Amino acid sequence: TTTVGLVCKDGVVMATEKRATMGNFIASKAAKKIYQIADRMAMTTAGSVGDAQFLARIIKIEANLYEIRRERKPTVRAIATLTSNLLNSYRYFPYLVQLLIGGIDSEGKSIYSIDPIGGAIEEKDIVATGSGSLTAYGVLEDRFTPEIGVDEAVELAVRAIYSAMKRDSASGDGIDVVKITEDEFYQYSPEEVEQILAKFRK
Amino acid sequence: TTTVGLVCKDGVVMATEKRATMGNFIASKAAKKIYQIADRMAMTTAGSVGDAQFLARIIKIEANLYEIRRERKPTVRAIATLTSNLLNSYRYFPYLVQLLIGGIDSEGKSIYSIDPIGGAIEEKDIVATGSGSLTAYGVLEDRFTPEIGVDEAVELAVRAIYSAMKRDSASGDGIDVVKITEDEFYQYSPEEVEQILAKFRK
Amino acid sequence: TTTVGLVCKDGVVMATEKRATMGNFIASKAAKKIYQIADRMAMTTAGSVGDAQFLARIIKIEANLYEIRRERKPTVRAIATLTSNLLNSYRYFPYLVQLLIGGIDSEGKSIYSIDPIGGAIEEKDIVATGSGSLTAYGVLEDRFTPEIGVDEAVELAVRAIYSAMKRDSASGDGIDVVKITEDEFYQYSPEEVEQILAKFRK
Amino acid sequence: TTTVGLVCKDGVVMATEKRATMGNFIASKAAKKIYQIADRMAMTTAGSVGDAQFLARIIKIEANLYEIRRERKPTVRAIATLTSNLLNSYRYFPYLVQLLIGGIDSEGKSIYSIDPIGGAIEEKDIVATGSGSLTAYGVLEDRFTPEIGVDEAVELAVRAIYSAMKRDSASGDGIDVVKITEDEFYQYSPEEVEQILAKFRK
Amino acid sequence: TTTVGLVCKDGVVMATEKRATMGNFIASKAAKKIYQIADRMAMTTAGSVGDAQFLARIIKIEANLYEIRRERKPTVRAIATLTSNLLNSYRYFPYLVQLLIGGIDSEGKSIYSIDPIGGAIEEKDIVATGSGSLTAYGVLEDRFTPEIGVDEAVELAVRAIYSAMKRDSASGDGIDVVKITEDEFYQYSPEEVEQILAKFRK
Amino acid sequence: TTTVGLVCKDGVVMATEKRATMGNFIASKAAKKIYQIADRMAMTTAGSVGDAQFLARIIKIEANLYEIRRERKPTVRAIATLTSNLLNSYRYFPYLVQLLIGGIDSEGKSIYSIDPIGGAIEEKDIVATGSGSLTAYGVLEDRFTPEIGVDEAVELAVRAIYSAMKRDSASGDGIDVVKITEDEFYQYSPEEVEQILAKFRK
Amino acid sequence: TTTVGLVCKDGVVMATEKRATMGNFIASKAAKKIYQIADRMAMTTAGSVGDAQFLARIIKIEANLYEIRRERKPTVRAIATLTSNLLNSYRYFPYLVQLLIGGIDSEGKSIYSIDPIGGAIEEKDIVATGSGSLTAYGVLEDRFTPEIGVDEAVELAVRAIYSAMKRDSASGDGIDVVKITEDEFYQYSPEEVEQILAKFRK
Amino acid sequence: TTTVGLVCKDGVVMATEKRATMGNFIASKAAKKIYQIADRMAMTTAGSVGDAQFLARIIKIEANLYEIRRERKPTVRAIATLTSNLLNSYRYFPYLVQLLIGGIDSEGKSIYSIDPIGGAIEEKDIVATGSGSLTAYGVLEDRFTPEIGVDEAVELAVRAIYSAMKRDSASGDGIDVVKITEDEFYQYSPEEVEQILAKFRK
Amino acid sequence: TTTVGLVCKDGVVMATEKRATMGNFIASKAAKKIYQIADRMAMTTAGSVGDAQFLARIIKIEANLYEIRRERKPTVRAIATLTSNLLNSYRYFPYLVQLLIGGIDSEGKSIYSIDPIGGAIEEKDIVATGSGSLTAYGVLEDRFTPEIGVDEAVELAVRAIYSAMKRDSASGDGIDVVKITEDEFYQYSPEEVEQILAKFRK
Amino acid sequence: TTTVGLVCKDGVVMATEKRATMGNFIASKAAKKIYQIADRMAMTTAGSVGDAQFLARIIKIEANLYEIRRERKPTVRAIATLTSNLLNSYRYFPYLVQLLIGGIDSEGKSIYSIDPIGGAIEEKDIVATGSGSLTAYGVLEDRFTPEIGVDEAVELAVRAIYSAMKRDSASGDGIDVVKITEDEFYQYSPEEVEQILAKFRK
């Protein structure tokens, strides 16, 4: 699995590989790795399923409660920070997941990355993180324009992953992409995303 | 020892492979892998017999408590979230077991297979699960439909676990079935498979 | 070391090996690897001597309490689940014993063998705790009939441990066999049993 | 891989199970395990398959050489002790396989077991040998009669290994047997043996 | 690292991978693992290309020389048995690599598998060697009849090795197929292989 | 440091060494590996020096306490079980020691061997704990009879310890024998018993 | 594995305790440890059945060679020192074996012991060699005389190996004795010895 | 590092060495290993320097606490018991010390050996607790008389440490000796003692 | 393992240890351990036992070869220096033995110690290689004087090693001593030596 | 172990430890490690004892042979090279010894150190070699002049050796000073040396 994330000029597009194989073993098939934290905030994870899944339940909760309490829609920066405390604190049992929490909020768009040993770093506009991590970064930076939209970003998302599939045998062949265009929370689902890269040739 | 799981339009089918070994301590072909969580929901278990049965008794209790407490039928979503959280607390009490908790519920039909590290895998499609996962995945994908007869899902499952008996000449024999159609618990039994081969001269 | 218990059509038969060694010295020849939990409920133990002797007091006390408390001789199932619960709570330093709890009760008979981390396997028959259990199981399986007298089961049981014992040096010399016939708990004692192996060989 | 060898009144019955280096999974339907050393001399082997074939040829060439050179058929003791000297010399090359040479000669019939790190001891009529050997030998001595014919001997031989197949997962499916009836040099071949093992339930 | 074969009624068909799989890397952009031993004889290797190609040139060189001395072609059987010897020398000088030698000869056609630990097995018509050899074997039995021609046998060679490159994609491109109809000694070349696998897409 | 114990018909004899050695390091010149738990109940220990000495005050003091509270002497059985609870608790940190607790009581004469992970079995025979066990058990068991006296057992103990002693410098010196003659507690003293073995020395 | 030996006043007698090492099997009902070296000389050997046979054959042949060239019989001492050079020098076939080569010679009657590291000593009495030596010595050296006959020494040999087996439940079974009285070379068979062992325990 | 503590008939004499070494360093010219616990009581130490001096502070005070609280003199058994309970409790936290606590009080004279494992009891005379201990023990036991005065005894003490000095150089350049006569507490000091044995060199 | 060695005024006396354990059997059963090189020459060994037995055979025969060849008796100096060369050649196998070689020659009386790799050193007083050496050197000086008898010597030598029995893991009573006085080569052996340690108490 | 070497106007003086202690082993208290190579050449060795002597013998032998073949006395230079070459050619038989060769020759005075791994370096007029080396250099240079004579030189040598041996627990006594004045070869030996450091007292 690999994950990438792009900061866009009308939203946030982020992508995960929802299918992972390691050899002829299917580590993940339709495995949950795309999560809705809040109405325009999403969590994408590359790494292990088991840390991903449990952590994803609590993050989602703490956002929901945040709007209930304070009557403000949570910013990415709040729920990222909260989550970093946990990853530091509970380090008595190790994690091995890289989180990308991003989305849309009222202040603007910022994407943060939480690491398996904690902390939070602001992504200026690019990341590629996971086992496909380097194959993926290059393509992003070569076609990065600061006028990147959701339309330029969805396609930029597929192609970087598509290179990772074909340069790794630790990647799957069942890509998911998630678009947040600030009018939708659309999740294209594995089939639709895959279909677009299969008229390239493989 | 392997477990499959399949979602049918008119219920859910799951199936088990028995035979227990604990080193050189050996057990007969009667050791359970099938636990009725709820009246129309089962847990098929693979991995460690010790760890599987101690958790079988906790989940059974949680389902009955829930059914009373909230005045409704159990649900696959309810229990899967509990079990996943359950394993994280008792990770310090390590239970090595691969579950599939699924059935028929008042929110539809589904299975969430729970990993021993508190993961959860979306299932409505194909999941293996077990140490015959590679062999199981072969048969289940070859013939599948979302509109699969419950008689065709027992049939598919028993051949998928026949492929595992090919690898396993002592680590697993015997075949039990969970049929859930919302009316009938049925069991294929070791016999049905053995008797074909008795007729066979090859 | 291996013990057997098997369900008869007029009770339950249990067998225990007698005489054990630690280092290069005899340490037991008058120690008991058969426990009376109630008059007509037995426990046989295969494994380390100190684990099995200590754990036996704890089942017993519970079993005495149950009669006092509930007005009732405890079912086999009820006393197995107690056993399982102790090994799970004290898994930091675990007990190295494989437990065999079979007897006769108000609700019939059953046998549950409890694994060394808690989790009990309901086995009806063809059950031996032990690591000598491979060799014993083979004889026990051929000649068991779902309808088998007490007289017969003690004869079958004796051969099972005599075959095992030649390939071990941990079962000791002298073989005990016990008959629970539902009106007595008769323990033949090593003396009489040794003389069945004069219809065999040594 | 585990073997048996019976000295019969109307020949010798030597036995092998199908195993093959190909990822530790049987090669074709028929996999080399029976080597015609000479007209009235056969080789069967428990242990390593590649070792089994390579050492088969050295003995075969020298056996054929013996017959050719001296104008006098070889004897079973001659081929047996020939094997030992060869093994112990050629130990500088990695080897470790337990060898049964047997057949018929003009001193009678006999089976000599050759150890890789020892000589050729005579073995009268009963020999075991393998990692399935405890299982195979147990039933072998019970249904021995030294008065056993080739027909009864083929059954015995197939059954003993079939039992040993059920306690390890290191023995693949299918049994070959070798008959030297003193005039013909038969290999019944996979098709025909399958029927002698499908009089049972498998 | 995997190879496949099927003996055909009018040829010998074998297929190899053109790019050794490091699991995340490849040897070079073009690479050869299908070697010509003679006009009607190829050799296809699994394991290191470095080791394999050295032994193949030695075996070629002696194949030409043997043919010249006799004025008549050597049999495929002789090539394999000479390889069993060659690898026995280089067992006292270790190499780990698995070879298959097949072709056409005067005595008919076959494929012989020659192992670093010695010996050679005549494979009747189904063959692989490697580690993903088991999935490839399975598929090779599916459409196999002795009524299969060369042109269908190349199609099926693709299907068999695609099994191990079905859930990988960094060596899903680059494949060899070798056929030998007795008119031709043809090696398809990636481009012709890509139009066959174009129909399976990936 | 080696200690032996055996039930006599008329009391219990226990023989000790009263010098303390851990191989070829001398711990103390003099030591008392005899502890009086009550008036006629006594304990010998073998294993760690540090543990034997320490443990010994604690056991005596609860035994005196049982006397005071109930105006009635603790049975040997009650001391041995109570000791098994305390070792159990102290098995969580290194506490390997073997205890022999016995004496005279109303329920007969008896010795219990107490294990470090708890559980106390009852030898009405012979038991020997220490490094000298093997040699001691050789002489002790030859002239053992259930009708043995305390006056013959004193003789028998002297011979059995002497074997360990003259052949090894890994054994303690200075044999002292302690006779529980039931109306007394007789301690022969180091001096007297050396002179019983002084029949090869002047 | 232990070999014992005692010297008679008009012969030499020796016994073995058999044990074949694979850790999976014990073969001792058709193999032996006693190989005749000269016509009235034998070698008893401890280790494995196979190690003994290969090792012994050499020594046989060289005993015959020397007999023929001198035109007079080789003494026990001569063969003993010969074996001692074999073992030290040619451990390019490495051996780990303990040997007794004893018998009747013109210059007396004797049992020589030869170590795996060579050097030949001479017990004109009791010897052992093995691990079971200490267990054997109890009955073996108590009833030893310088006037032990050949008839009394085959009896005594049985008691010492049966003492060695007494510690086991029954394991290591395989008793062969040799009688060397110059008027006979009796090389026993299991059966034959079994009836003398049937006068100490039927 | 060795320490002696021995009974006089009017006093107790206990002695110490001085100078601490690494075997390549003079770590300290003088290290404290002689304490007054009470006036008439000493603790002298063999083993680690650091644990020894920290441990002497606690005991010196809780010995004073016994004078203060109980208004009676501290007895050797009372200080020795109470030390032992602490070490035993705190054995997990770093300790590796051998304490000799002796002197004269109303109980009498007795010396107690206390292990950092636990320990407790008692030597009538002569102890070491050291590592020149073995050569120390020879001379001590040779010249020991039970009427040994304090003049005779200090000379003996000095010689025992001198046996250590020759074994391992660390007692050289300073030996300290204490005489306790139950009217004085005199400390000889290093110099005074050293100059007796330095006068052998001129 | 330890040797002692002393030069007398008119002889030489050396002695060795015996009746310990070697491998796992009692070592002295009738063993040689002081080897006769020449009439007025011996070798005693501390180290590997069976290496010394074998090596003894080589140097006795070369001592006879020097005497037969050069018409001039072997000097003490000669035989030690030859050993040096032999020990160098065998520096790869277990062969590490520290040997003292003594006797009388025309140079006068001497004992040479030879280091494991070779290396002779004249000592005309006392010597002791061994782990028993420091303890030996102690006992030796107390009544060793420049002039001593050859029957006052056998007492001292016997003493020293008996004090070393306690400093060594094992060793018994009855050891080898040899006196070589230019008038006798008398080897006492356990029976005679036992009586000389019967004045030396326990 | 340590050696020092100084160049005088008329001599070379070097010094060795003449007693080696490691644990409780003393190789002999008369043990030579001062080797005379030629008439006015010496060698003083630090490092392992046995390898010092064995290599040293060979160089004495060499000094003579060169001396005879060239007809002229050896260079200091000659033998320093010679040793280094021998050592380098014999690293399959490694001698783990640090040499110092010096003496007087026609070139004059010099001392070479030869590494245990071969190679000859030259030292101007001071040298220390071994583990005592750091302290020894400054101790030696204090009273150094090149014109310092032999009489002050042997005194000056003791102080370096003396410092190293007194902190060390590995030495404490036993030192040889070698004087080579172009007229004498004195070996001072431990006793005479003793009063040189009895001046510097404790």
Q: Which two tokens stand for residue C144?
A: 């068991």
Asked if residue A49 lies in contact with residue A28, where contact means CB atoms within 8 angstroms, the answer is yes
> What are the distances in angstroms from CA D157 to CA D7, D30, D172, H128?
11, 18, 16, 70
Are C123 and B23 inside 8 Å of each other by CB? no
Q: Which two tokens stand for residue D46?
A: 């428990």
Are A170 and E23 inside 8 Å of each other by CB? yes
Chain J residues in contact with chain H using a Cβ-Cβ cutoff of 8 Å: 24, 131, 166-172, 194-195, 198, 201-202
**E52 by DSSP, 3-state: which?**
helix
Position A59, amino acid: I
Using the structure block, give the residue that is written with the tokens 């320093």.
J80
Q: Which two tokens stand for residue I155?
A: 């007492």
DSSP string, E67-125: HHHHTSPPPHHHHHHHHHHHHHHTTTTT--EEEEEEEEETTEEEEEEE-TT--EEEE-S
* Facing B197 at nearest CB: one of D169, D191, D201: D201
Looking at residue C152, the DSSP 8-state letter turns out to be H
Q: Is F119 exposed, middle or buried (0-12, 13-18, 19+ CB in 10 A)?
A: buried
| Angle formed at CA D2 by CA D1 and CA D4, multiple of 5 degrees | 145
Asked if residue I24 lies in contact with residue I57, where contact means CB atoms within 8 angstroms, the answer is no
CB contacts of J169 in chain H (<8 Å) are: 21-23, 168-170
Secondary structure (H, E, C), chain G: CCEEEEECCCCEEEEEECCCCCCCCCCCCCCCCCEEEECCEEEEEECCHHHHHHHHHHHHHHHHHHHHHHCCCCCHHHHHHHHHHHHHHCCCCCCCCEEEEEEEECCEEEEEEECCCCCEEEECCCECCCCCHHHHHHHHCCCCCCCCCHHHHHHHHHHHHHHHHHCCCCCCCCEEEEEECCCCEEECCHHHHHCCHHHCCC
Asked if residue C75 lies in contact with residue C106, where contact means CB atoms within 8 angstroms, the answer is yes
Contacts of A201 (CB under 8 A, 6+ apart): none
Are B119 and A30 inside 8 Å of each other by CB? no
* Facing F169 at nearest CB: one of I19, I169, I201: I169
* Method for structure elucidation: cryo-EM
C-alpha A100/C-alpha A115 separation (Å) is 9
R_g of chain A, CA atoms, integer Å: 16
Tell which of H131, H133, H134 to mutate to test the I interface (max I CBs under 10 Å). H134
Are D27 and E134 inside 8 Å of each other by CB? no
C-alpha A85/C-alpha A99 separation (Å) is 14
- Cβ-Cβ contacts under 8 Å between F and G: the total is 3
| Angle formed at CA C51 by CA C50 and CA C56, multiple of 5 degrees | 100
User: Peptide bond preceding A44: is omega within 30 degrees of 0, i.e. cis?
Assistant: no
C-alpha B83/C-alpha B95 separation (Å) is 12
Q: Which two tokens stand for residue D169?
A: 């997962």
**I136 by DSSP, 3-state: which?**
helix
Are E168 and A202 inside 8 Å of each other by CB? no
Chain D residues in contact with chain G using a Cβ-Cβ cutoff of 8 Å: 81, 84, 88, 91, 98, 113, 115, 117-131, 133-134, 137
- Please give the sequence-ordered ranges of beta strands (E in DSSP) within I8-49, or none if there are none: 12-16, 21-22, 25-26, 34-38, 41-47
Q: Which candidate, C184, C192, C177, places its Cα nearest to that of C33?
A: C177
C-alpha B123/C-alpha A31 separation (Å) is 8
Q: Is J144 exposed, middle or buried (0-12, 13-18, 19+ CB in 10 A)?
A: middle
Q: Which candidate, I162, I166, I170, I148, places its Cα nearest to that of I190?
A: I162
For strand C20-22 and strand C25-28, is the pairing parallel, antiparallel, or unpaired? Answer: antiparallel
Q: Chains C/A: 3 or more C-beta pairs closer than 8 A?
A: no
Asked if residue F158 lies in contact with residue F172, where contact means CB atoms within 8 angstroms, the answer is no
Contacts of D18 (CB under 8 A, 6+ apart): D26, D30, D31, D33, D172, D173, D174, D175, D176, D190
Residue of chain H whose alpha carbon sits nearest to that of J132: H24
DSSP string, chain F: -EEEEEE-SSSEEEEEESSEEETTEEEESS---EEESSSSEEEEEEE-HHHHHHHHHHHHHHHHHHHHHHTSPPPHHHHHHHHHHHHHHTTSS---EEEEEEEEETTEEEEEEE-TTS-EEEESSEEEEETTHHHHHHHHTTS--TT--TTTHHHHHHHHHHHHHHSBSSS---EEEEEE-SS--EE--HHHHHTTS-SS--
C-alpha B76/C-alpha G129 separation (Å) is 69
Full strand arrangement of the beta sheet holding H185-187: H4-7, H12-17, H175-180, H185-187
**D66 by DSSP, 3-state: which?**
helix
Point out which residues pair with C13 in neighbouring strands: C6, C179
Point out which residues pair with H178 in neighbouring strands: H14, H187
> What are the distances in angstroms from CA E5 to CA C108, E1, E126?
61, 14, 7
Determine the distance in angstroms separating the CA of I118 from the nearest CA of chain J, rounded to an integer. Answer: 6
C-alpha C166/C-alpha D138 separation (Å) is 12
Q: Chains E/D: 3 or more C-beta pairs closer than 8 A?
A: yes
The helix (run of H) or strand (run of E) holding residue B78 is: helix B76-89
Q: Chains H/G: 3 or more C-beta pairs closer than 8 A?
A: no
Q: Which candidate, H19, H69, H8, H87, places its Cα nearest to that of H42?
A: H8
> What are the distances in angstroms from CA E109 to CA D30, E3, E46, E91, E104?
17, 19, 21, 28, 5
Determine the distance in angstroms separating the CA of C76 from the nearest CA of chain B, rounded to an integer. Answer: 17
Q: Which candidate, E76, E153, E64, E67, places its Cα nearest to that of E108?
A: E76
Count CB atoms within 10 A of the CB of residue F7: 24
The sign of the dihedral angle between the CA atoms of F72, F76, F78, F84 is positive
- Cβ-Cβ contacts under 8 Å between H and I: the total is 7
Number of H helices, E strands in chain I: 5, 12
Contacts of E28 (CB under 8 A, 6+ apart): none
* Facing D169 at nearest CB: one of B170, B194, B201: B170
Q: Which two tokens stand for residue H54?
A: 């920290």
> What are the distances in angstroms from CA F111 to CA E188, F77, F131, F150?
86, 9, 20, 15
Breaks in chain D after residues, C-to-N cutoff 2.5 Å: none
Q: Which candidate, B113, B119, B106, places its Cα nearest to that of B2?
A: B113
Looking at residue D167, the DSSP 8-state letter turns out to be S
Catalytic residue among F1, F16, F21, F181: F1
> What are the distances in angstroms from CA E100 to CA E42, E127, H143?
9, 9, 87
Q: Which candidate, G135, G192, G143, places its Cα nearest to that of G166?
A: G135
Asked if residue H86 lies in contact with residue H96, where contact means CB atoms within 8 angstroms, the answer is no
Q: Which candidate, F180, F202, F185, places its Cα nearest to that of F14?
A: F180
Using the structure block, give the residue that is written with the tokens 């090996």.
C17
For strand F34-36 and strand I120-123, is the pairing parallel, antiparallel, or unpaired? Answer: unpaired
Are J169 and H166 inside 8 Å of each other by CB? no
Give one word for H63, left, alpha or beta, with left for phi > 0 and alpha for psi -120 to 50: alpha
> What are the distances in angstroms from CA D136 to CA C43, D141, D167, E187, G99?
33, 9, 10, 49, 32
> What are the distances in angstroms from CA C147 to CA A68, B187, C152, C158, I14?
68, 24, 10, 18, 80
Determine the distance in angstroms separating the CA of A50 from the nearest CA of chain B, rounded to an integer. Answer: 4
Cα A131 from chain centroid? 14
Asked if residue D158 lies in contact with residue D15, where contact means CB atoms within 8 angstroms, the answer is yes
Q: Which two tokens stand for residue H185?
A: 């507490």
Number of domains in chain C: 1
R_g of chain C, CA atoms, integer Å: 16
CB contacts of B170 in chain D (<8 Å) are: 165-169
Q: Which two tokens stand for residue E171?
A: 């060596």
User: Residue C117 — φ and ψ, nearest 5°?
Assistant: -170, 5
CB contacts of E95 in chain D (<8 Å) are: none
Q: Is C146 exposed, middle or buried (0-12, 13-18, 19+ CB in 10 A)?
A: exposed
CB contacts of I138 in chain H (<8 Å) are: 135, 138
Contacts of I180 (CB under 8 A, 6+ apart): I11, I12, I13, I40, I41, I42, I102, I103, I104
The number of C-alpha atoms within 13 Å of F4 and in the hemisphere containing its C-beta is 33
Longest distance between any two alpha carbons in chain J, whole Å: 51
C-alpha B184/C-alpha B175 separation (Å) is 18
Q: Which two tokens stand for residue F144?
A: 């053992």
The end-to-end CA distance of chain E, in Å, is 18
CB contacts of F134 in chain G (<8 Å) are: 134
Q: Which candidate, J121, J145, J105, J133, places its Cα nearest to that of J6?
A: J145
Tell which of A21, A24, A163 to mutate to test the E interface (max E CBs under 10 Å). A24
**E59 by DSSP, 3-state: which?**
helix
Point out which residues pair with I34 in neighbouring strands: I44
Catalytic residue among I1, I44, I45, I83: I1
* Facing A202 at nearest CB: one of E24, E168, E202: E202
CB contacts of B24 in chain C (<8 Å) are: 131, 133-134
User: Residue F99 — φ and ψ, nearest 5°?
Assistant: -120, 145
R_g of chain G, CA atoms, integer Å: 16
Chain C residues in contact with chain F using a Cβ-Cβ cutoff of 8 Å: 23-32, 48-57, 92-93
Q: Which two tokens stand for residue C130?
A: 């032990």
Q: Which two tokens stand for residue J79?
A: 């033998």
Tell which of C18, C26, C169 to mutate to test the G interface (max G CBs under 10 Å). C169
CA dihedral I74, I75, I80, I84 (to 10 degrees): -70
Indicate which CATH number applies to the domain containing E107.
Answer: 3.60.20.10
Helix axes G49-70, G76-89, angle to 10 degrees: 130
CB contacts of I137 in chain J (<8 Å) are: 26, 29
Residue of chain F whose alpha carbon sits nearest to that of H92: F93
| Angle formed at CA D114 by CA D109 and CA D115, multiple of 5 degrees | 155
CB contacts of D167 in chain C (<8 Å) are: 134
R_g of chain F, CA atoms, integer Å: 16
The sign of the dihedral angle between the CA atoms of I66, I68, I70, I75 is positive
Point out which residues pair with G13 in neighbouring strands: G6, G179
User: Residue C73 — φ and ψ, nearest 5°?
Assistant: -75, 130
C-alpha D40/C-alpha D105 separation (Å) is 7
Q: Which two tokens stand for residue C110?
A: 């059953």
User: Peptide bond preceding C129: is omega within 30 degrees of 0, i.e. cis?
Assistant: no
The helix (run of H) or strand (run of E) holding residue A3 is: strand A2-7
Which residues of C are known to be catalytic?
1
Reported structure resolution in angstroms: 6.3
Position H44, amino acid: T
C-alpha F42/C-alpha F83 separation (Å) is 13
Q: Which chains touch F (3 or more CB pairs under 8 A)?
A: C, G, H, I
Are H124 and F50 inside 8 Å of each other by CB? no
C-alpha B80/C-alpha B122 separation (Å) is 11
Secondary structure (H, E, C), D99-112: EEEEEEECCEEEEE
> What are the distances in angstroms from CA A194 to CA A23, A200, B44, E200?
20, 10, 33, 15
* Facing D131 at nearest CB: one of G24, G52, G57: G24
Point out which residues pair with A164 in neighbouring strands: none
> What are the distances in angstroms from CA H145 to CA D194, H6, H133, H141?
91, 11, 20, 9
C-alpha F116/C-alpha G71 separation (Å) is 68
Q: I151-181 burial, b for 16+ CB within 10 Å, e for fewer?
A: eebbbbbbbbbbebbebbebbbbbbbbbbbb
Q: Is D129 a catalytic residue?
A: no
CB contacts of F57 in chain H (<8 Å) are: 81, 120
Tell which of G1, G22, G169 to mutate to test the C interface (max C CBs under 10 Å). G169
Q: Which chains touch J (3 or more CB pairs under 8 A)?
A: H, I
User: Residue E20 — φ and ψ, nearest 5°?
Assistant: -60, 140
Asked if residue C61 lies in contact with residue C21, where contact means CB atoms within 8 angstroms, the answer is no
Q: Which domain holds residue G161?
A: 1-202
CB contacts of G27 in chain D (<8 Å) are: 113, 127-129
CB contacts of C143 in chain D (<8 Å) are: none
Contacts of F29 (CB under 8 A, 6+ apart): F19, H123, H125, H126, H127, H137, H141
- Cβ-Cβ contacts under 8 Å between H and J: the total is 35
The number of C-alpha atoms within 13 Å of G89 and in the hemisphere containing its C-beta is 7
C-alpha E20/C-alpha E170 separation (Å) is 10
C-alpha I26/C-alpha I50 separation (Å) is 14
Determine the distance in angstroms separating the CA of C6 from the nearest CA of chain G, rounded to an integer. Answer: 24
Q: I124-142 burial, b for 16+ CB within 10 Å, e for fewer?
A: eebbbbbbbbbbbbbbbee
C-alpha C118/C-alpha B98 separation (Å) is 17
Are B118 and A53 inside 8 Å of each other by CB? yes
